[PDB]
Design a protein around this nucleic acid. Structure first.
Lengths: 80, 97, 105, 93, 95, 103, 78, 97
DNA sequence: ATCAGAATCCCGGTGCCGAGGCCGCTCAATTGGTCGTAGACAGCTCTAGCACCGCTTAAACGCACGTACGCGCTGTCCCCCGCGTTTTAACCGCCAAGG
DNA sequence: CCTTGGCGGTTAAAACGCGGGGGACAGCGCGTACGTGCGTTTAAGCGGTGCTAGAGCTGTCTACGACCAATTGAGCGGCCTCGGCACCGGGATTCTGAT
C-alpha cells in the first residue's frame, strides 16, 4: 500500500527533464503525485465503467482505447 | 574522474530521455501502483498486461506533456526551475482538476 | 472490369465504408456515391502520411517505419497535427526540442 | 472471422507513392487506429449535416462540404480535386 | 406553420412541482430550451457510444444508467440514477 | 401522455421520438426513453430548485437570464457540467482579487 | 478596419477582466486576438453556409460553428 | 478629488463583473465580421440573432482570457500584464503551439 | 485619526410591453394487434492473468564538493490612469426596398 | 414577413494631452540545494511454470419493443390584462484620498 508516494522521486525528475526543464525542485514530485492521482482516477473510472456496462469484471485493452478516445487521448499501436 | 558545473550532463541526460523511446519508468512499481489504485474500486480483480502497459504509456505521455506545460509557465515567469504553482496555474487553464 | 474499386482507379475499398455506414445505424438510408468519394478521401489521407513518412525515413537512414519515425514526421507538419491535436503515438516519443532558457548562466 | 482492414490496401497505396520505402505492421495498426477515429468524426459530422437539412442519406455534396469543414483549405482543395475524378471515373466504369 | 417541440409549459410544471411560487422570464426560457436539450444530446451521445462500443444494436435502460455516472460526478449521478430507476419501476408497475 | 402514469412530467413520447429522430441506434428499449426522461426531469428539477431560491433571495419571483447562470456556477458539479460552455447574458460570478485591491 | 477597435474599449475590457495597467505592445495583439478567434469560427460558418444552401445566414449556422469550435452559446437559440 | 490610479481601476474591476452590458458597440463588431468574411464569400446576410450571439461569445471569451492573463500575472507576482502573459494564456489551452 | 470628494443604494414614484393564464386546433403522443431478432442464458475452450519462484543490474537513497539562480534589497525610470479638454456618430424611431 | 439598406440628432462612447507615482524591472547582497560524482543496497528486470475464471465463441431460447392502424387532448401557437421588475429623483452612506 501507499504506492502513491511509492513513485520514485528520480522517475518524476526524469519525466520533468524529458519535459525540457533544467532545474528540478523538490516539491515538484509531490505535486506530480497529487495531479497524477486524479488523472489516473478519471481514466480508470472511464475504462472500468465501460467494462462494467458490458457485464464484465475484467478490463481488456479495447475499453481503455475507447475511454481514451472519448476523453481525447486516442492511443496508437495498441489497437483501436 | 572530474566533476562538471551544473547544466553539462543534465542537458545531455535530457537528450538521453528525448532521443530514447522505451519506457523510462520501471514497470513493476507502476504496475503495483495500478494494482493498488484499482483494488480500491472493486476487490479481487484481474487486469490485463496489455491494458496496464497502455495505461503506463499514456501516463508517461501525459506527464511529459504536463511538464512541458510547467516549463512553458516557468519560462513565462522568468525562471528556470519549475514549481508546483506552475502546475496549479496550468491545470486550471486546461480545466482538469 | 469486375471490382468497383479497381474500375474507378481507387485502391481503397468502397464496400468497407458502405458496409460501415449501413450497419453502423448512422442513418437509415446510406448512399453509394458518398462511400465512393470517401474511399478516395481516405486514399489521399493515407497517401499524405506515407508521403512524409518516406522523407522521415531517411532522417535516421532507416527503412522500417517505427513510432519514432511517425512522431518525427506527423508532428512537424501543421495541418494534420492541428487536426490531430489530441493524438499521441504509442512508444513514439517527443521531438528533440531545447528551449531558449536551457543554457546555464 | 473476417476482420476487414486496409492491411494490403495501405501497402498498395504506399507502393503507388513510395514503393522503395518499407513499413512495419505496428505502423499498419497505428494507421488503422488513426483512420478509425477519422471515420468516426467524419460520420458524426455528416450525420449532423444531414440532420440539419433533415436528410436521411448522405450524398457526395455533403461529403465535400464536410471535407471543407474538417480539412484545411489546402487539404480540402486537394481532397476535392482528387475525389471529383473518382466519381467521374466511377460513373463510366 | 410547424408546431415544433419546446419547453414552454414543461418548465413551468416542473417549476411548480419544485417551487409553488416562482416565476421565470422568457429570456431565461431561451436559456433553458437550449440547455436542457443539449444535456439531452450529451446523454444520447454517451448512450450511443456505449451501445456502439459494446457491439449492441438494441439499447436497453441499463445504458443510460451508467452513461449518467460517466457524464456526471458520482454524487450528482447517484440521485439521478436512483430517481430514474424508481420512475421506471413505478411506470412498469402502474397501468 | 404515458408520463402521467409514469410519475413524470416530461412526456415519454417526445424523448422516444427524439431518440428515433436522431437515429442513435436501430432499436431502443422501452426503459431507455422513460429512464432518460426521468433523468432529464430530475436534472432540471435541481436546475429550478436553485433557480427559484436565487430568484427569491433577490426579493424577486421572475427569473432573468442572469438568475439562472449564477446557479449554474454556484455549484461545483453543475459548474463541472457547464465548464467550457458559455450562456448568453450569463457572464461570470463576481470575484475580487486582494492583490489588485489597494493596501 | 483591423485597427477599428478603439484603445479605451480594450482598456475597459482589461478592467473587466481585472487588469489595472497594460503594457505598450499588448494592445496590437489584443485586437488581433479577437480577429482569428472570430476568423476560425466564421471559417466554419461560411462553410456551413455552403452546407446551408442559402445566401442568408440563419442563427443556427453560428450554433454549428460554436458547437464545433467549443464555445457553444445558450439563451439565443443555441 | 484626484484618486490613485487603481482605486477607480479596482472599482471598475468590481463593477464590470456584475454588469453584462456590451462594452464595444455593435457596429465595429459588424465591421470586423463583414470585412473578414468578405474574404471567404460575398452575399453573406448576418441576421440580428447571430450577430448578438457572436458578440456576447466574443466578449465572454475576452473576459475569460483577461482573467487567465491576470491569473498568470499573479503567478508572476505582477500587476501590469506583459505580452508573454496572453501568449501563455492562449498557449496552455492548446489553441497555440 | 481628521478633513473632504464623488458615486452608489434604498425610498418614493414611474412604466411597460410582454409573462402567464387562457382560446383553439391538430397532429404527435398513446394504445390495441403483429414478428422477428439480436438480446440472453448456458456451456466448451482456453489463454492470457494471477501468482509463485529462480537468477540477475542500472536505478534508488544517501554522502559529499561546489556556486549560482532564486529571493530579497536597490535603486530607476517610467508610461498608461484619473483628470482635463475635445470629436464624433448610433441607433430608437422613421422611411424605403427586397428577396 | 423577416431581413436589408437609409435620415433625426445629441449626449455618451470614445479620443487625445498633463501630472504623476506606485509598480515593472534591470542591477547588487546572500543562501542551500541541485548538478555531479560516487558509496551502498536492492528490489525490480527477465524469464520458467502451474492454476484458473470468467472472455471469446458457439448451442439453444425467446420477450417485448419496432412496424401497422386508430383515438384523443397536451401542448404548442397565439392573444388579452395588468404587473414584477427595470428605471429616475431624495436621503443614507460608502467607499477612498491627502494630511
Amino acid at each position: 500500500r501507499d504506492n502513491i508516494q511509492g513513485i520514485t522521486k528520480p522517475a518524476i525528475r526524469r519525466l520533468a527533464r524529458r519535459g525540457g526543464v533544467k532545474r528540478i525542485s523538490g516539491l515538484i514530485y509531490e505535486e506530480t503525485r497529487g495531479v497524477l492521482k486524479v488523472f489516473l482516477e478519471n481514466v480508470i473510472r472511464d475504462a472500468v465503467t465501460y467494462t462494467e456496462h458490458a457485464k464484465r469484471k475484467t478490463v481488456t485493452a479495447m475499453d481503455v482505447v475507447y475511454a481514451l478516445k472519448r476523453q481525447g487521448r486516442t492511443l496508437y499501436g495498441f489497437g483501436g | 574522474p572530474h566533476r562538471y558545473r551544473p547544466g553539462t550532463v543534465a542537458l545531455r541526460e535530457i537528450r538521453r530521455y528525448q532521443k530514447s523511446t522505451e519506457l523510462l519508468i520501471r514497470k513493476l512499481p507502476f504496475q503495483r501502483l495500478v494494482r493498488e489504485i484499482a483494488q480500491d474500486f472493486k476487490t479481487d480483480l484481474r487486469f490485463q498486461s496489455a491494458a496496464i502497459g497502455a495505461l503506463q504509456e499514456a501516463s508517461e505521455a501525459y506527464l511529459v506533456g504536463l511538464f512541458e506545460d510547467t516549463n512553458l509557465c516557468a519560462i513565462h515567469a522568468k525562471r528556470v526551475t519549475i514549481m508546483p504553482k506552475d502546475i496549479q496555474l496550468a491545470r486550471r487553464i486546461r480545466g482538469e482538476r | 472490369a469486375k471490382t468497383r474499386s479497381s474500375r474507378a482507379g481507387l485502391q481503397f475499398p468502397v464496400g468497407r465504408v458502405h458496409r460501415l455506414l449501413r450497419k453502423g445505424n448512422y442513418s437509415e438510408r446510406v448512399g453509394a456515391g458518398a462511400p465512393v468519394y470517401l474511399a478516395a478521401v481516405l486514399e489521399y489521407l493515407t497517401a499524405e502520411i506515407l508521403e512524409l513518412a518516406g522523407n522521415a525515413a531517411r532522417d535516421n537512414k532507416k527503412t522500417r517505419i517505427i513510432p519514432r519515425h511517425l512522431q518525427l514526421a506527423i508532428r512537424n507538419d501543421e495541418e494534420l497535427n492541428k487536426l490531430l491535436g489530441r493524438v499521441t503515438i504509442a512508444q513514439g516519443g517527443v521531438l528533440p526540442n531545447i528551449q531558449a532558457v536551457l543554457l546555464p548562466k | 472471422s473476417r476482420k476487414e482492414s486496409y492491411s494490403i490496401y495501405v501497402y498498395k497505396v504506399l507502393k503507388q507513392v513510395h514503393p522503395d520505402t518499407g513499413i512495419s505492421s505496428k505502423a499498419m495498426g497505428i494507421m488503422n487506429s488513426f483512420v478509425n477515429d477519422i471515420f468516426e468524426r467524419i460520420a458524426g459530422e455528416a450525420s449532423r449535416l444531414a440532420h440539419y437539412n433533415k436528410r436521411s442519406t448522405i450524398t457526395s455534396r455533403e461529403i465535400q462540404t464536410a471535407v471543407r469543414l474538417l480539412l484545411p483549405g489546402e487539404l480540402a482543395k486537394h481532397a476535392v480535386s482528387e475525389g471529383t475524378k473518382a466519381v467521374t471515373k466511377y460513373t463510366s466504369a
